[PDB]
């Protein structure tokens, strides 16, 4: 299991990832974002992290934009508290990797494409959607708008 650390509060994973609770439990994990519609909350039951789902799927009709706002209020508890978070989706990172870009978009003064690449460099599996992608480049916008 490999839990990239985009940022040092910060991991982005996969599917099994957030099933390896040891791992988990080494780096301070105390927030969880799972990012697909029909994958479980792995650990729900036994108390140990607060959790928030997404549900979303790797379409090319989903909108993550909507949950951008949602997810990062999520990782300013974590980073206000003290504490790590790991967001997952499944296998390829594509939805999961979207909302870590555009966190970066919204509190680091990065370009989209600075952000990108960012995270590209340390996972190089991303391959967010064309469809993310987009709502990336108009979140960009946005932002540069005064939005």
């Known amino acids: 299991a490999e839990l990239t650390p985009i940022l040092p509060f910060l991991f982005l994973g996969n599917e099994q ?15 969880v974002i799972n990012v697909t519609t029909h994958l479980p909350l792995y650990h ?3 108390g140990l992290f607060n959790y928030k789902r997404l549900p979303a799927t ?14 990062f209020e999520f990782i300013e508890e974590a ?3 003290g504490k790590g978070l790991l967001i997952h989706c ?25 952000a990108y ?24 916008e946005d932002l540069n708008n005064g939005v």
Request: with cysteine.
């Open 17 to 31: 990832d957030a099933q390896d609770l040891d791992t988990m439990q080494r780096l301070n994990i105390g927030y």
């Open 79 to 81: 980073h206000q508290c």
């Open 58 to 71: 790797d379409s090319n009709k989903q909108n993550l934009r909507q949950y951008f706002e949602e997810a």
């Open 44 to 46: 729900y039951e036994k």
């Open 117 to 140: 690449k960012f995270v590209k460099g340390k996972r190089p599996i991303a391959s967010p959607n064309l469809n993310f992608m987009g709502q990336l480049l108009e979140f960009e």
């Open 90 to 114: 499944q296998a390829g990172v594509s939805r999961s990797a979207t909302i870590v870009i555009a966190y970066l978009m919204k509190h680091t003064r990065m370009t989209m494409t600075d």
